[PDB]
Design a binder for these strands. Structure first.
Ligand code: NI
Lengths: 216, 216
DNA sequence: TTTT
């Protein structure tokens, strides 16, 4: 049973360096080429380079030469990759994957990936603002979670009682800070008759806010 | 250098239908030893890429016989005889020799009937205005196809600066898409104007779908 | 045979 255990999520600052690991198990680590793949958020897969643990031979994508550095501690059966001069374009999920020898001659085993986030922003708690209809047997309500860092936040409606008709839109970076929104659609005999509350939790700032949606 | 072109970029099909994705190298990728090292990978969201086909037409162990690959020299193809729900994700062709290079990927999604968006506009919250901010939010829910354009108008004049959009992935139940468009201004700027308009242009409508409000 |  071949496994490639990668290191955890990393939060880094611009210009810094990040050294990530990939522990290989279940096979002769030295006998196979270890490949590294990059995937910027929402983009495709890019090949960075490879290393042959046995003799430490490395090959790089011209683009990542003098940017990424592949090494290995054959003793620890672990491969490492260090990305220096970190910029916003270095934020991505990086995978390590083994290239099989006989039979398949392909990348048969992959790691789970290491998400790296390069930002100079400091932990900032979110501003949760209730979105009520303008002053139709259905009413659409919303909740705006603006200006936080880092991901993630968890947004629920009525503590999770309201699961149907909800659309939580993925967060977006608006100048180093994230913004997220969510909409819930209920019948007109539910609101404002009954109470509808938006719950937001931002772990990194130990924040837990509840926002009741009140009519205008 | 070898360029790998994948077509189509997006591929909507009903479950049960056949699927065929194409991959083209800018030049022959045949190795000197005579073997073509072309592979196909499937990446389900939030998951690592998994090996499907190796050496142009060979199926990796455990891959369903629905999957078959072919092609020669410059043009390669992955055919799926009957699309299952478990086949949805992004497909990448990979060139495993010389300089390993991935293709841009083809996203396999579900085809459904057209659906016009339900637009909802929301004025800035009192809590947000109290802090000198003014975010006008517009939700465009449950539409299909995913192609849509949103134009913001202030007092009739179009506004491009300050807009932030976000799209959800294809709805897991009804296969529709939703998006959020937020227009951020300052309380001052917001108060210097009266009418706010969010209009959408979608194929399910000859005229634009509009939602406006007068802050007075 | 792959990592030329
Ligand atoms: Ni070229």
């Amino acid at each position: 049973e071949v496994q490639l255990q990668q290191s955890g999520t990393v939060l880094a600052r611009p210009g810094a360096s990040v050294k990530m690991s990939c522990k290989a198990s279940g096979y002769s680590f030295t006998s196979f080429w270890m490949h590294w793949v990059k995937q910027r958020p929402g983009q495709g897969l890019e090949w960075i380079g490879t290393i042959y643990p046995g003799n430490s031979d490395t090959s790089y994508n011209q683009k990542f030469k003098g940017k990424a550095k592949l090494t290995a501690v054959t003793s620890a059966s672990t491969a490492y990759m260090e990305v220096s001069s970190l910029t916003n374009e270095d934020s991505a999920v990086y995978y390590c994957t083994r290239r099989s020898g006989y039979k398949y001659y392909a990348l048969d085993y992959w790691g789970q990936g290491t998400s790296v986030t390069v930002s100079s922003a400091k932990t900032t708690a979110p501003s949760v603002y209730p979105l009520a209809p303008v002053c139709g047997s259905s009413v659409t309500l919303g909740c705006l979670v603006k200006g936080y860092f880092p991901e993630p936040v968890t947004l629920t409606w009525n503590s999770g009682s309201l699961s149907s008709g909800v659309h939580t839109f993925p967060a977006v970076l608006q100048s180093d800070l994230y913004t997220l929104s969510s909409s819930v659609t209920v019948t007109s005999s539910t609101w404002p008759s009954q109470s509808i509350t938006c719950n937001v939790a931002h772990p990194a700032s130990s924040t837990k806010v509840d926002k009741k949606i009140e009519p205008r | 250098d070898v360029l790998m072109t994948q077509t189509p970029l997006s591929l909507p099909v009903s479950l049960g239908d056949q699927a065929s994705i194409s991959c083209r190298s800018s030049q022959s990728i045949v190795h000197s030893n005579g073997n073509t090292y072309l592979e196909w990978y499937l990446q389900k969201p939030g998951q690592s890429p998994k090996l499907l086909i190796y050496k142009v037409s060979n199926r990796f162990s455990g891959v369903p016989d629905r999957f078959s690959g072919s092609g020669s020299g410059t043009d390669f193809t992955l055919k799926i005889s009957r699309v299952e729900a478990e086949d949805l994700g992004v497909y990448y062709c990979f060139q495993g020799s010389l300089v390993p290079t991935f293709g841009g990927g083809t996203k396999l999604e579900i085809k459904r009937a057209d659906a016009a968006p339900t637009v909802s506009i929301f004025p800035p919250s009192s809590e947000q205005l109290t802090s000198g901010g003014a975010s006008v939010v517009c939700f465009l829910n449950n539409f299909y196809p995913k192609d849509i354009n949103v134009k913001w108008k202030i007092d009739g004049s179009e506004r491009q600066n300050g807009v932030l959009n976000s799209w959800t992935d294809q709805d897991s139940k009804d296969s529709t898409y939703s998006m959020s468009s937020t227009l951020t201004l300052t309380k001052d700027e917001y108060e210097r104007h009266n009418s706010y308009t969010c209009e959408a242009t979608h194929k399910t409508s000859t005229s634009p779908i509009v939602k406006s409000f007068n802050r007075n």
